[PDB]
Amino acid sequence: QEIFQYVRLSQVKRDDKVLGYRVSPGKDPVLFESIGLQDGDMAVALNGLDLTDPNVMNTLFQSMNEMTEMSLTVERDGQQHDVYIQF
């Protein structure tokens, strides 16, 4: 699957601790806009799992060829909602 078509991510850290990921537009505006992301959203979970747990994320990514969809939880103006990514 090609996450980079949908979104770009950068770390937001306190010292060496990752707090979440800043969202930037992916390669394809149709995907970024149709799923309702906005530049500067803060991504905090993927499929309900904490994005800041690298081993958990590694395991999830190893399975992604079997995935047909994902949810990205983002924080915007102090509120959270889920963004639905269709593969």
Swiss-Prot record:
Signal peptide: none annotated. Coiled coil: none annotated. It is found in: Cell inner membrane. It comes from the Bacteria. Belongs to the GSP C family. Involved in a type II secretion system (T2SS, formerly general secretion pathway, GSP) for the export of proteins. Required for secretion of cholera toxin through the outer membrane. This is Type II secretion system protein C.
